[PDB]
Amino acid sequence: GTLHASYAAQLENVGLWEWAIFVLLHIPHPHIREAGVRELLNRQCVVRESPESLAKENFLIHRLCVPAQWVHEAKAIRSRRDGDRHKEALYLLKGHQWNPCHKLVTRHLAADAVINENYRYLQSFLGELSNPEHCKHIQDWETAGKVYLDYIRVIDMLNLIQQDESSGCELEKLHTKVMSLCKWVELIHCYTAKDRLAQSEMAKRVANILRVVLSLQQPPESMSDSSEPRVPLRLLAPHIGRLPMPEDYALEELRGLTQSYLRELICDS
């Protein structure tokens, strides 16, 4: 143990730390070997992709047979120290650390991605986490990570329906998913003022999507020229009242619902 540790420390000081890993891999004891290799990776692994860093990583993975997971774990820990939450999430994903990745994405990346409308960026992480083999290992996937993914999928399906003259079957699938999202957006745990802002923007967008879907599900047989599309209030009101909206917007929505309900009562007399 002294010979392996002393020569590995000499190689670390000379900057040949990839060969210090090779020296540590000769340690007979598996737990001591594993601890020493991970400790050296956590010290010397660089997050910046230089041709030299990539040559050293290729040497460890392909010649030394070191698990690529441990190199990615060390890069995730280093990215956390540097404050780069994006690279931390990327390396936790590549490192097969699904639970830490999901907690980081939901607490720190999801709100900033929703507020900036960068849905493709949030979908790259949540899409890979959504695999049926990974989801089983993720704590609280259904209450957080899935809600953001299902929200992105509802936006993507609405953008597709705006570009193609779509069949009524895709509109019913969109309606059922939007109605499910209205229930799950309330259950998002908000820790920061940004998370509340993102939850309120999701709630506002989901309510507007629900109105558009309910307006498009109508057969074209009520064209009396001069009234806005008749949104059925009985299907809309139970879902708008459950959405975590800002007080000003909830009051505008309730004023719109009360004015449209008064118009339904004036047209049925």
Partner: protein
């Protein structure tokens, strides 16, 4: 040949008590009688002061960096009976926690292995040791070992999370048995090993070889060795190395490393557990290494020239 790589002007207004590098060796924390903790970025032979942390009402004795997986966290302890937890968020340092559960000077702080979470041991001149645990949810949890040392506890140091040899004897499917242990030194001339059992701290071992106050204790990092090693130093001018070859026998053997002509204040292991630094009242830092025959030799006497 040991060579000076860099000289840091700390701009402290009074005596510096401790100086700790972060896990990556890119940041230096220092603490002083001036009641401040200073943090420097140390890169390419430059230093930049990045924080002046104020919150102690007396001399700050020790600083300790937490493991980087929990972010940039620093503990400090002081004569003012406080332990302060500092954290960097978005490039700003703040006081995230203050512990005032000691009745006298808190002389030493040491973070546990990261496998155990955010756990801090604190040794005090009230003779107690406090274990502070942060679970991520709610307030810091506190376990106090009352009367850990008679007169006072001077130093605390955590054992490695994995027992020596446990990676060699495991057939491919049992998780390493993580045992929370630390060593303490006190004004009762004792070195004591503590173990957590059933959520309570017990005195596991009592190590008797010093004839005056134990000033410092350092548990050696276990990199692939089958042995546990502790260093201790004392007011009696002695440094002992304690070895245990079997974690089941609980048998600790003292070896006298050296007898200095003055008090020995500090002992610190290299990260590779192959060099021991020893700091005396003679203003010298000596470096010691074990030879293949198990003999300890002084490999550097760094005279403070200038």
């Amino acid at each position: 040949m040991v060579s000076v790589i860099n000289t840091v002007d700390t701009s402290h207004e009074d005596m510096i008590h401790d100086a700790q590098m972060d896990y990556y060796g890119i940041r230096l924390a220092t603490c002083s009688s001036d009641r401040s903790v200073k943090i420097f970025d140390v890169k390419n032979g430059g230093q930049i002061l990045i924080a002046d942390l104020r919150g102690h009402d007396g001399p700050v004795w020790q600083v300790a960096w937490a493991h980087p997986m929990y972010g940039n966290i620093l503990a400090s302890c002081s004569y003012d009976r406080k332990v302060i937890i500092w954290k960097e968020e978005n490039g700003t340092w703040e006081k995230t926690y203050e512990y005032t559960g000691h009745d006298s000077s808190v002389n030493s702080v040491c973070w546990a292995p990261h496998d155990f979470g955010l756990v801090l041991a604190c040794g005090s001149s009230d003779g107690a040791i406090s274990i502070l645990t942060f679970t991520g949810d709610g307030p810091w949890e506190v376990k106090k070992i009352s009367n850990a040392h008679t007169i006072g506890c001077n130093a605390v140091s955590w054992a490695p999370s994995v027992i020596p040899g446990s990676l060699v004897d495991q057939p491919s499917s049992q998780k390493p048995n993580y045992i929370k242990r630390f060593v303490s030194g006190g004004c009762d001339n004792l070195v004591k090993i503590w173990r957590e059992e059933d959520g309570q701290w017990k005195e596991d071992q009592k190590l008797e070889a010093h004839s005056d106050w134990v000033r410092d204790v350092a548990w050696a990092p276990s990199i692939g060795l089958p042995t546990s090693t502790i260093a201790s130093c004392s007011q009696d001018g002695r440094v002992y190395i304690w070895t245990s070859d079997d974690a089941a026998t609980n048998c600790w053997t003292p070896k006298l490393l050296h007898k200095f002509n003055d008090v020995v204040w500090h002992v610190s292991w290299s990260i590779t557990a192959n060099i021991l630094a020893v700091s005396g009242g003679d203003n010298k830092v000596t470096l010691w290494k074990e030879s293949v025959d198990g003999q300890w030799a002084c490999i550097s006497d760094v005279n403070k020239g200038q």
